[PDB]
Amino acid sequence: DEANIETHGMVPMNRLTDDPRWLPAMSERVTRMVQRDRNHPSVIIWSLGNESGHGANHDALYRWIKSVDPSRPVQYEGGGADTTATDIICPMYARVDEDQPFPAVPKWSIKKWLSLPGETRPLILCQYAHAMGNSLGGFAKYWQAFRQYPRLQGGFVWDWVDQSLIKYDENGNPWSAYGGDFGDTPNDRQFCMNGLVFADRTPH
Amino acid sequence: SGIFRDVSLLHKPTTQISDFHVATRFNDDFSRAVLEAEVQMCGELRDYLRVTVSLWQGETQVASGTAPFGGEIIDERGGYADRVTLRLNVENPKLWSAEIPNLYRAVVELHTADGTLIEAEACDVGFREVRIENGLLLLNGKPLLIRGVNRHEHHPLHGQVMDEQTMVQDILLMKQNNFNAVRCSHYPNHPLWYTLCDRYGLYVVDEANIETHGMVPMNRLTDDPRWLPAMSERVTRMVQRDRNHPSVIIWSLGNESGHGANHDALYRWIKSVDPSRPVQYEGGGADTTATDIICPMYARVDEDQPFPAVPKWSIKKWLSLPGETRPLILCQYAHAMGNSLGGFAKYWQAFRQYPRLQGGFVWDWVDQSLIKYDENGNPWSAYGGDFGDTPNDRQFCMNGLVFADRTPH
Numbered sequence: 001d002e003a004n005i006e007t008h009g010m011v012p013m014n015r016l017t018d019d020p021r022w023l024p025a026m027s028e029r030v031t032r033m034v035q036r037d038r039n040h041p042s043v044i045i046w047s048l049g050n051e052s053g054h055g056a057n058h059d060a061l062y063r064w065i066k067s068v069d070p071s072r073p074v075q076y077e078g079g080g081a082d083t084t085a086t087d088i089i090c091p092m093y094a095r096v097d098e099d100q101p102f103p104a105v106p107k108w109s110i111k112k113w114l115s116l117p118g119e120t121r122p123l124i125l126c127q128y129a130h131a132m133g134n135s136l137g138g139f140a141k142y143w144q145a146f147r148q149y150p151r152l153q154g155g156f157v158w159d160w161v162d163q164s165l166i167k168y169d170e171n172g173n174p175w176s177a178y179g180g181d182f183g184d185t186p187n188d189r190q191f192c193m194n195g196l197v198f199a200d201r202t203p204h
Numbered sequence: 205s206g207i208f209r210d211v212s213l214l215h216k217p218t219t220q221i222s223d224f225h226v227a228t229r230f231n232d233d234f235s236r237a238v239l240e241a242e243v244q245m246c247g248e249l250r251d252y253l254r255v256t257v258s259l260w261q262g263e264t265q266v267a268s269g270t271a272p273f274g275g276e277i278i279d280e281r282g283g284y285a286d287r288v289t290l291r292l293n294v295e296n297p298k299l300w301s302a303e304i305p306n307l308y309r310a311v312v313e314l315h316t317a318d319g320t321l322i323e324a325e326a327c328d329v330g331f332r333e334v335r336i337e338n339g340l341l342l343l344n345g346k347p348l349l350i351r352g353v354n355r356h357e358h359h360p361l362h363g364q365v366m367d368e369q370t371m372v373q374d375i376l377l378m379k380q381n382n383f384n385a386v387r388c389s390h391y392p393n394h395p396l397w398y399t400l401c402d403r404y405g406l407y408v409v410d411e412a413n414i415e416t417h418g419m420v421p422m423n424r425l426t427d428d429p430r431w432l433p434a435m436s437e438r439v440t441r442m443v444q445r446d447r448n449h450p451s452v453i454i455w456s457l458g459n460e461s462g463h464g465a466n467h468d469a470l471y472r473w474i475k476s477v478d479p480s481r482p483v484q485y486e487g488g489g490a491d492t493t494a495t496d497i498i499c500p501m502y503a504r505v506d507e508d509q510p511f512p513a514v515p516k517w518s519i520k521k522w523l524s525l526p527g528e529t530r531p532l533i534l535c536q537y538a539h540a541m542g543n544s545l546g547g548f549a550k551y552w553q554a555f556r557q558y559p560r561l562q563g564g565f566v567w568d569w570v571d572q573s574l575i576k577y578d579e580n581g582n583p584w585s586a587y588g589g590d591f592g593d594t595p596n597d598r599q600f601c602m603n604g605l606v607f608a609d610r611t612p613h
């Protein structure tokens with residue numbers, strides 16, 4: 001269960017989450033979620049949101065949850081996937097054997113990440129295998145690694161269902177539309193369709 | 205069998221230096237060091253006796269300390285009146301490593317206050333710190349990448365007798381072939397070897413002469429307290445002999461003797477007596493309580509071999525097993541028997557990618573073949589069974605990167 005906090009478009013990404021003036025608004029997104037959902041057995045992990053860098057507001061909120069509900073781990077991927085605001089190394093799109101050593105926020109091979117000096121946490125990818133279009137090549141390589149390494153405890157595929165929307169042609173017949181099809185601009189075109197299933201639930 | 209290393213006579217004074225230990229400690233950036241030397245005497249104590257420890261860089265004396273005997277109080281009965289510890293401050297020391305084997309000379313003099321020398325002892329000193337931190341084996345604060353080989357003391361004509369020319373030949377070929385480390389498989393070596401490794405620059409794993417491989421199970425003796433005394437001397441007397449060589453960076457408790465409580469006792473003894481070097485030991489699964497380094501033999505890079513009790517996990521996976529944090533350096537890997545070394549690049553790629561995979565020691569340097577002569581008197585290379593020996597293990601004695609005469613494979 002994940003708080004409704006994503007500030008991906010900021011530059012740098014943590015511009016708001018490291019600003020104390022935004023701590024109150026962020027706090028309510030996290031606290032009100034825990035107050036609503038904490039009795040559901042299906043929730044096993046809380047997440048602090050998505051793609052909002054790593055700011056001090058995250059560390060304050062991580063600790064709040066750890067205090068109020070010690071029954072569930074807290075994870076958060078921003079700022080490098082392995083910051084002090086996450087109990088689980090939870091990268092997005094880290095590869096199985098290939099490192100992508102981006103500055104400040106490298107994406108190590110998952111097998112390598114587990115054993116970096118001093119690291120001891122489990123690793124569960126918050127997003128992996130981007131199923132956009134004809135994709136999922138290399139899926140098996142993840143599963144072989146998850147089964148061989150105890151601390152590679154799986155992951156969440158990206159993602160379930162294409163976000164295509166229905167439009168109707170001049171003859172009234174429906175068709176699947178994506179970014180820019182409503183006059184929207186700028187837009188990111190077909191990047192909204194990344195699912196294992198089509199919007200109507202037919203499998204890819 | 206036989207008397208296969210040197211025999212000598214040594215004439216010491218009755219009041220003499222009976223032992224000395226040199227340690228070097230550093231500040232955070234290695235810009236300052238303290239050399240501390242504990243010196244012990246035998247003989248009759250006299251108030252006019254003194255010890256001076258002097259440190260030389262070439263022909264220049266850089267530090268010195270002099271004191272009478274009498275150590276600090278250590279317990280309710282006092283201290284060692286027959287010992288003294290000198291402490292020398294050394295600014296910006298030249299550090300020792302296999303890359304640049306900088307050495308100083310320490311001279312330990314037992315003398316009188318008014319200047320007469322009774323006798324002197326001395327050693328080459330390499331300033332370096334070896335420690336494991338955060339899962340990495342560091343030398344002078346930097347993480348090593350061990351390009352090692354295991355080397356037996358073997359000569360095809362002389363057997364297990366070692367000579368300077370051969371040792372030098374081996375070191376030169378090792379360095380010329382990008383090795384920086386050697387494991388004394390599986391016993392303390394001829395004394396000259398450590399002096400050469402100190403001077404030419406190779407990291408050394410010094411290993412006690414204890415291997416009980418043929419027991420069933422392998423720890424039958426090493427888990428038996430009645431064998432603790434015999435084992436103990438093999439480890440303690442090695443540390444007593446070799447502790448002042450800078451090239452020795454890691455102590456090993458022996459080889460292929462399972463994992464017994466005697467190992468745990470001896471591991472602890474070394475950690476108490478010499479905190480300056482990690483202790484490793486592979487027996488009993490390579491990651492037991494008796495080793496500071498996961499040090500398997502022939503663990504594969506990607507492939508697990510999950511043997512009961514003593515599995516050989518893929519080295520990449522081993523590092524990350526739940527709770528594990530130690531560095532991993534293979535004590536033996538890539539078995540170079542005959543036409544072999546297939547797969548060698550796979551190890552290197554992994555060692556460079558994983559910080560905590562810090563290398564390994566290839567098995568092994570030189571084939572143990574022996575020369576025999578045909579009726580013609582022409583020589584030929586012999587292996588197991590060729591002397592009528594039986595049972596024997598045939599050509600398993602030839603696993604070297606070089607032939608017995610040092611020609612490369």
Ligand SMILES: OC[C@H]1O[C@@H](OC[C@H]2O[C@@H](O)[C@H](O)[C@@H](O)[C@@H]2O)[C@H](O)[C@@H](O)[C@H]1O
Pocket residue numbers: 092127191192194
């Ligand atoms: O389905 C789209 C996918 O995009 C991911 O971001 C892609 C790539 O876009 C660049 O604009 C960013 O600066 C770069 O860091 C980023 O990796 C995003 O991580 C996923 O959550 C998803 O939206």
Ligand SMILES: OC[C@H]1O[C@@H](OC[C@H]2O[C@@H](O)[C@H](O)[C@@H](O)[C@@H]2O)[C@H](O)[C@@H](O)[C@H]1O
Pocket residue numbers: 460501536600601603
């Ligand atoms: O160069 C020989 C090599 O033998 C290694 O042991 C090999 C093999 O011996 C068999 O008797 C056992 O069934 C098996 O478990 C063992 O692996 C030894 O580990 C090396 O140190 C080396 O002598």
Ligand SMILES: [Mg+2]
Pocket residue numbers: 186187188189
């Ligand atoms: Mg666009």
Ligand SMILES: [Mg+2]
Pocket residue numbers: 258
């Ligand atoms: Mg003098």
Ligand SMILES: [Mg+2]
Pocket residue numbers: 595596597598
């Ligand atoms: Mg046989």
Ligand code: NA
Pocket residue numbers: 145146147148149150151152153154
């Ligand atoms: Na797993």
Ligand code: NA
Pocket residue numbers: 191192193194
């Ligand atoms: Na998308």
Ligand code: NA
Pocket residue numbers: 349554555556557558559560561562563
């Ligand atoms: Na490495």
Ligand code: NA
Pocket residue numbers: 600601602603
């Ligand atoms: Na052999």
